[PDB]
Every structure is written in structure tokens, then in C-alpha cells.
């Protein structure tokens with residue numbers, strides 16, 4: 259087995275319908291990697307589509323400091339294995355949970371740094387004519403601080419996109435409406451709600467009234483003291499008109515975030 263041969267398994271760091279992820283050290287180089295191991299999807303299935311979106315995302319993107327680096331992918335014993343960068347900080351989602359417990363927080367300065375850094379990653383993805391389509395805390399990973407976009411299984415072309423809808427909680431209305439003429443702006447919407455989660459918002463709605471209230475352009479209630487100017491920024495990032503939301507490039511060059 260290549261997996262056993264090339265790597266020694268240290269720790270299971272994730273599990274779910276995606277299978278399992280393991281912290282592994284690669285024998286040859288002594289470095290740490292996160293390796294996803296899953297059953298090879300049934301041919302013709304959503305799972306196979308998602309897996310192909312991921313393979314061909316790596317084929318296009320190469321390497322960037324706000325994107326989780328992809329190293330290799332193979333199949334064996336009817337399983338597939340994906341070897342990625344190990345981000346020693348876990349996901350933003352884990353860090354938010356930890357904050358909700360110890361009890362610490364992301365204040366304004368930290369939130370702005372998160373917006374900029376993930377924004378840089380988006381900027382790069384979009385310039386390669388791709389969109390991520392599943393931005394959320396559990397898909398943002400931390401190295402220690404560097405924030406990096408991972409989990410590329412929903413990535414698709416700005417056109418023609420094969421749209422597998424992301425998490426309903428972070429999903430823009432126009433995507434739900436089968437309008438895919440400005441998909442980059444859906445990544446922007448999701449990022450803003452991602453930053454709102456980091457700022458300590460209650461769990462985001464999956465549907466019903468408050469869900470629609472957000473797509474009407476209204477920020478979920480936050481628990482802390484944010485500037486009117488940072489607020490306005492997040493507000494326009496979920497503007498019902500995706501053309502009014504800033505592009506990634508407009509985002510990374512904004513006075514509020516700069517530095």
C-alpha cells in the first residue's frame with residue numbers, strides 16, 4: 259500500500275461523510291501532511307463529481323499562500339487518498355468553537371486580518387477563472403498566523419459552472435435562484451458571513467425567516483463593538499445585488515482592511 263509505505267499515520271484529525279483525515283508524517287521528508295482517505299465514489303454520483311471538481315481544481319491552481327497546498331492524490335483498495343498541507347491550527351470552525359468555550363474572541367483587528375487573508379486567496383482563485391462555492395469556517399484552515407482556503411470539492415469554472423450548491427447557511431440567494439452569472443460574488447457573500455461567525459454570531463440559519471432576512475442584506479446580530487465602517491463593509495458584502503458586492507480584488511485593496 260502506497261499510503262502505509264510512504265507515510266506513517268499519527269492521528270485522526272477529521273471524520274464525516276467525506277471519510278477520514280489523518281495527520282501523517284511522510285517518511286522521506288519527515289514533514290507533516292493532512293491525508294484524506296475516503297471510499298472511491300460510485301461512478302456517476304455526486305460524490306464522484308465533487309471529487310473531480312477537486313482534482314481538476316488542483317490541476318489549475320498550483321500554489322498560493324492563502325490556499326491549502328495540494329501535493330498528490332491516488333487510489334488504492336477502492337479508496338481515494340488526497341495529500342495536502344497540514345495546517346497546525348486546525349480550521350477556523352474549531353477555533354471559533356474554542357473561543358465560544360475558553361472563553362476568548364476575535365476582535366475587530368483580528369477579524370479584518372481574516373477578511374484580508376481569505377480575500378487574497380479568493381482573489382487568486384478568481385483570477386484563474388475559478389470559484390470556490392463553499393466558503394465557510396470549516397473550510398478555512400490556520401497555520402501558526404496564516405489563513406488558508408481548503409476543501410475544493412465545490413470549485414467550478416466561472417463559466418461554464420457545474421454548480422453544486424454550498425452550505426445553505428452561507429449561500430447567496432441568486433445562486434439558490436439558479437443565477438450563475440456572477441459566482442465570484444457568491445464567494446464574497448460567504449466570506450462575509452464567515453467573518454460574522456468569527457465575530458461571535460449565533461449559529462446561522464439554514465432556512466426560514468431569518469435566513470431570508472440575511473439575503474435581504476441584513477447582518478446577523480453580532481455580540482461586540484465593531485466600527486460603522488467595518489460593518490458597512492460586511493453589509494455591502496451581502497448586498498442582495500451581487501454586482502454591488504466588491505470583487506475579491508476590490509476587497510484586498512480596501513482602506514478599511516489595509517493594512
Ligand SMILES: C=CCn1c(=O)c2cnc(Nc3ccc(N4CCN(C)CC4)cc3)nc2n1-c1cccc([C@H](C)O)n1
Pocket residue numbers: 271272273276279292293294326340341342343344345346347348349352396397399408409
Ligand atoms: C485533507 C483534507 C482537508 N483538510 C485539509 O486540507 C487540511 C489541512 N490542514 C488541516 N489541519 C488540521 C485540521 C484539524 C485538526 N484538529 C486537531 C484536534 N482535533 C480533535 C480537532 C481538529 C488539526 C489540524 N486539516 C485539513 N483537512 C481536514 C482535516 C479535518 C477535516 C477536514 C474536512 C474534510 O473539512 N479537513
Ligand SMILES: [Cl-]
Pocket residue numbers: 439440441442443
Ligand atoms: Cl463577477
